[PDB]
Amino acid sequence: CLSGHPTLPCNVLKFKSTTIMLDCGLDMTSTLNFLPLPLVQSPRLSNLPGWSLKDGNAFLDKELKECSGHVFVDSVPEFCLPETELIDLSTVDVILISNYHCMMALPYITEHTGFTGTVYATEPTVQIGRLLMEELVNFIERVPKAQSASLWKNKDIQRLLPSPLKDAVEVSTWRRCYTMQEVNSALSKIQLVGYSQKIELFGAVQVTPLSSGYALGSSNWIIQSHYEKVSYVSGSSLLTTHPQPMDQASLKNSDVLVLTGLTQIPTANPDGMVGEFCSNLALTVRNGGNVLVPCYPSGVIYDLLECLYQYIDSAGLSSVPLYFISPVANSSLEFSQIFAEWLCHNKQSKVYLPEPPFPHAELIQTNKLKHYPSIHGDFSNDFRQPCVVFTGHPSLRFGDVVHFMELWGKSSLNTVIFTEPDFSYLEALAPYQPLAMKCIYCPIDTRLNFIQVSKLLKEVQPLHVVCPEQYTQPPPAQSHRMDLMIDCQPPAMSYRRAEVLALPFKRRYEKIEIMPELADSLVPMEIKPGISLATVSAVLHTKDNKHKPLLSGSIPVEQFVQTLEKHGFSDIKVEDTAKGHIVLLQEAETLIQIEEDSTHIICDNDEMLRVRLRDLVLKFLQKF
Amino acid sequence: PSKSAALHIDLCKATSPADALQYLLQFARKPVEAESVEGVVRILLEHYYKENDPSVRLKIASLLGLLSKTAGFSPDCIMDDAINILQNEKSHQVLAQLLDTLLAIGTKLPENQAIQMRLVDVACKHLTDTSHGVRNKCLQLLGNLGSLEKVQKIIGDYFSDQDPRVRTAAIKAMLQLHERGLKLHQTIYNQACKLLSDDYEQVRSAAVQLIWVVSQLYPESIMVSDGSWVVRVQAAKLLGSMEQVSSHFLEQTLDKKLMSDLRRKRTAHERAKELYSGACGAFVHGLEDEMYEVRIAAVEALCMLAQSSPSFAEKCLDFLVDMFNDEIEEVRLQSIHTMRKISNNITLREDQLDTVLAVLEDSSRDIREALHELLCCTNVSTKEGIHLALVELLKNLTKYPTDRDSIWKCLKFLGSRHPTLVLPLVPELLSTHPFFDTAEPDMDDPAYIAVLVLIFNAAKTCPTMPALFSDHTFRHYAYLRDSLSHLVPALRLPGRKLDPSQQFLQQSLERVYSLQHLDPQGAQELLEFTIRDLQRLGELQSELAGVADFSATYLRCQLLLIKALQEKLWNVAAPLYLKQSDLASAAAKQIMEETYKMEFMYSGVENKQVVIIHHMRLQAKALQLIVTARTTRGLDPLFGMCEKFLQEVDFFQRYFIADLPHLQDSFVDKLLDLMPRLMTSKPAEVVKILQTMLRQSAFLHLPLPEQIHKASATIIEPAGESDNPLRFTSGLVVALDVDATLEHVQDPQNTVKVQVLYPDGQAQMIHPKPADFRNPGPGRHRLITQVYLSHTAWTEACQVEVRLLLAYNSSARIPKCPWMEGGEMSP
């Protein structure tokens, strides 16, 4: 006997690791670690120069925490992981997946503690996640220096001594590595799951994807029992409409409406930010040197790719090619080429060489597009850098962007324009602040803007909507509301708050199959009898008609004496009292008293008359 | 005192679910108890469990269960947990947490009888639930608690429960009972029938394992369990396209199930589609059905059943050969492996072309050696296959001359296997004429030496081999036999014909040990002569080179020490120390490096050698202290280094307790006996007494052993070669190179570094990668790691230096391999 309660161990607003439990389903939503957290350490680079080696000494004879402008750790970035301790992984059956993003911490919970069950997701997201983990481990294992940061994690009494932004986060269990074993031994468990499937896990609860349009496979799984509408939302967008835009034809009478992904930037304009980025790239290619745009692997970068392709009809002349440095670049390109069914209905997925998502990237490949998906001796043909280079990277410490930043660190000649807003200003450029670059941070991101979730809640008319984080308060360095409207009450979640907001009391299943029985007559409730021997098989008690009801109802004395006379009885004397009626039958000396909701019969030693009177009085009421 | 802090933190705030959960997360993610006060902490945690916030109670129970695993599962804690769980059946997760705590406190430490494993099982069995409350938990409870070697009726009647997810717990518990014996009955197999048609996942994948184990227990008490469960296993594995997880487990179970009687009537019909009681396939329909993770298990079961049964190979070799065109890098090597494991009592007439072409489609650097090992151990029917293999090996040689050793070895094995099959091909391989005798091939040609060594290896048991030889073949054999013997054997051609080191080492060591009471110059020249002799012996002898080099290094240490003690500085004024007057200022560092090398480079060291080398290091530190104090002008720094030296002496004497009364009249024991008095005077007279004592202290004898050195090789991977200026730029990396192999490194993982010495002042030391360390030759290793090089333009092709080093506890380096220069690679 339990209820649904989300046990979330994270306080990340972009990602989520909620676990919406149930009575017998025990389902868990997507689980993700802290991706933007491993940036305070030294960046992982090859061919260590002399500039990033000799710096200021540590504070109080540490010899493991260098300092150059800010605090840094010269060791492994030491990837973060949520607590996930007060819930054992031995009673878990399935883990949910998001849009190719929520598997960075997936192999850490598959072959470590528990989770011996199955897993359900779609093909494009799982393939992009595989490529992401592959490029991540490829960027980690290059120059694999040993861990030398296992001393400041404990003894937190002195952890608050260093400068801020370093002691704000605690250390519970961080793994820092994948060893190329669980990452490829855990991927051989995924099943082929499409959109709106009928997998029917555990024989009672059903999940139905929604396929919201944000990226290639932004599916919002909707776990639901016989009578329940638990809705989980990972990512959605109502402005791009290219990758099968979101539809609201199913989530009408939702229950909890777990909303996780948000935009976090309400002041910027997508069209305006793309326009200013185009102007910036044009003005920096007109004069100066090469251009560097540190971006993520395949996914969100495709709109920027299409914009820079269509920008060739502007003041920017030719001879401005595009380099793409990524170990999984060719695989990502061929996967975007092969994946075309997950596009829009007729706007994008036309199949007549007009996919408008990936075919345009190959249509312009014959004019000026050299791929070169490596850095190990491939640019020896021509080296002048009149181009723009995009290097995939999980963060600003693992990818090859740090080598290129140390290559042409001179300012007024290159750009450091970013595309992912899941970082900061003073910490992201902390080891590179002794420069004079423009430091532009155009936030390319469209994830359920505040102007969209408002109209979504208006057209949904929801109830008991749960808020993911404590952002119900106005954000810092801003002067506005930027909150969500709730009629009943605004909930709250934290690192270890297992709040219970649900009550499924086995509403209606009944395992109805081959039910044939009589039906009585009444005003509006035609009651009937039931059958025993349910013989349940799997989450369904199919109580079929095969091999004690109580009584209720007032019995009239007038109809009683009428049926006594017309059945064969005689010499029956009836008198009245203050509220009841007393009837005497001379045979066997039967005395019967009928009061308001009361009947009492007294007779002598006789069996046949007793059972006769019993069956005569029992057919005057309805059986319940 | 660990429980008092937890109680204070829990009673300070006393929130509904904030303070309790925070304290639980702070106490669970922290360090363990590792003490005897764990019972008090467990009692304090259990005292606050009977309250609200069932989630906090479950978290505290889980924390107590995790903490009780550090050898703290006593009888009192188990009794307390049993008494608490008897009435804590309020929530669903609370009972599961209590059962897990009972399992961690009873099935991890006690593991015995007398209410240690039987009472908890009965308590868990009597604690049944109504709807998926503790069933999945008490199943593994009773699974990890074995009562005695006689408890199966409960699982037998629970095998037909409501929730199919409880059958998984039942089957894992019954497998846990199986892997401990327990005399499993034969009736379960009948119940196993109702497990074959389950209409669910994660059950049949274990049902095939169940039928496999119950068939492999004993094929009696019943046709008669002979080739009967194999039919059911094949029927369950035939639906491989319906589940990618239940098909590989079925093949892995059949791999061991094939060890039964294996009746031919049920085995020969399985290799065909149309059955000839067996009415299923899964042999010719289980290969080209889905992903290769089940194909691997299928071929594993195939080779496992072909190894035991000598038959069935002649009708499965075709199927094992025709599965090569699979365009998968995994199935190819697995096919090579399953063919090498079955290379016995097999034939090869025309199926060779489908198994040899795996070397032309791609490089396959790691598969080529396996293919060559396969081609040499197999048998060929006719000479056409021999000729095909020979011309293919010649093509691989003229296209890839980087693996000629494997080709020569495989040709040697092929010639030693069947030498008759090449007899009708001798005048066809080498170009010979019956009446010309011309066209002499090249001597150093890597294309003719292979045929030569093949003929020489096939010339062992041939009656008349030289009857078809040419004129130069005899001299070629005479030259190859006398140059190498591991490939060319001995023949009977008519043209051709046909512990001193240990005692010497012992004599040298006893001469160094005994002859020590003489003049300093005589001792010095004796040490020099013995060092030269030991170096010559190490350069000459091979198997006795490690101990010889060890003794030579020890004698060099002693010689440098005795030369430092005979320096002219002590004969001249001390407080002057002009310059170049003490040869020990630069000799103490060399002695320390020599001790580090003697301690870390060698593998077979004994504790006696360790204490002797530590005494030598302490003597070197004392010499360095003396040399520094001889020139130090400030009296204040003297106290610091003298206290440091006394601290090192105390640490040494505290770490080494035994073998101290063994060493007589040694510097260490003299300092240990005199140190209670040296801690009362000025560091000046302290170091004076230290100096006058170290002069004629002793000469400790080192015990020899079977130690070996730790050196590397100079493999052609980016080794010394011509200029070969590669094309690259100044911006990005130049290129990538490959390192060399290793020999006798004593787990080179996390021990061997790779240093890169650029012509500039900068030097980069790339850390090793543990994934590339290969060990198929225990006693010899191999290091194939990519090295990254990048620098600004050089305007020339001067030089570059890459080298291997070693790692220490704190920090140190050891030069092992000879300095090998790399390619120029002008950017």
Coordinates of C-alpha atoms in Angstrom, one line a residue, chain A residues 519-528 622-624:
Chain A
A519 CA -30.0 -7.4 -14.4
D520 CA -32.6 -6.1 -12.0
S521 CA -34.7 -2.9 -12.4
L522 CA -34.6 0.3 -10.3
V523 CA -34.7 4.0 -10.6
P524 CA -31.2 4.6 -11.9
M525 CA -29.0 1.8 -10.4
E526 CA -29.9 -1.6 -11.9
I527 CA -28.0 -3.7 -9.3
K528 CA -27.2 -7.4 -9.9
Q622 CA -33.2 -6.1 -3.6
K623 CA -29.9 -8.0 -3.1
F624 CA -26.7 -6.0 -2.7

